[PDB]
């Protein structure tokens, strides 16, 4: 298009709290930690 | 009138019972997790990370 909250019969889809960019950042952090430190990054520093 | 009341109250009871069943399934999962945690965490030493 460019109000969908009342167009349908009261049904809406709330957005997730963590955007796909945030999930990608989390997976990136996990992957970099695993690659550069192994399992140590999970136990502590 | 009593049939209307009975239907409504029976629906309320059924809803409550179904909610209780679902919450009890949740609590059963949590209790299984706690039992496994006591087995592998207190009665031993787990190498499972985190």
């Amino acid at each position: 298009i460019a109000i969908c909250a009342q167009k349908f019969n009261g049904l809406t889809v709330l957005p997730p709290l963590l955007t796909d960019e945030m999930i990608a950042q989390y997976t990136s952090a996990l992957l970099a930690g695993t690659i550069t430190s192994g399992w140590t990054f999970g136990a502590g520093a | 009138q009593i049939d209307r009341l009975i239907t409504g109250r029976l629906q309320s009871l059924q809803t409550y019972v179904t909610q209780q069943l679902i919450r009890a399934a949740e609590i059963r999962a949590s209790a299984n997790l706690a039992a496994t945690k006591m087995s592998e965490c207190v009665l031993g030493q787990s190498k499972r990370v985190d």
Binding site: Q6, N9, G10, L11, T12, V13, L14, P15, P16, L17, L18, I23, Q25, Y26, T27, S28, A29, L30, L31, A32, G33, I35, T36, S37, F41, G42 | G8, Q11, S12, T15, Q19, D50
Partner: protein
């Protein structure tokens, strides 16, 4: 047809014979897991009695069914957020690979 369970394979068992690998492979497999649903929310008053005062007044007789349905859906959505949080947000910091 009558489905086949798998390929028949007898093991050459013997009380003094062992089988030791001489080479290996590094296999990468894929495992897919669902983590969350779509955070659906329903406007119960508008769904049952869309823009109708008389219907809304009648629906108000049925007590708090509508409220508890909304509460259940809100719990579902919060639970989905928590699921995503627990699956992914398990690292305290944000590491980045060196150049």
């Amino acid at each position: 047809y009558t489905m086949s369970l798998g390929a028949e394979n007898s093991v050459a068992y013997s009380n003094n014979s062992i089988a030791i690998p001489t080479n290996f492979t590094i296999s990468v497999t894929t495992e897919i897991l669902p983590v969350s649903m779509t955070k659906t929310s329903v406007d119960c008053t508008m769904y049952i009695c869309g823009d109708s005062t008389e219907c809304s007044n009648l629906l108000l007789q049925y007590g708090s069914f509508c409220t508890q349905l909304n509460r259940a859906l809100t719990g579902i959505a919060v639970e989905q957020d928590k699921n995503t949080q627990e699956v992914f947000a398990q690292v305290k910091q944000i590491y980045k690979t060196p150049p």
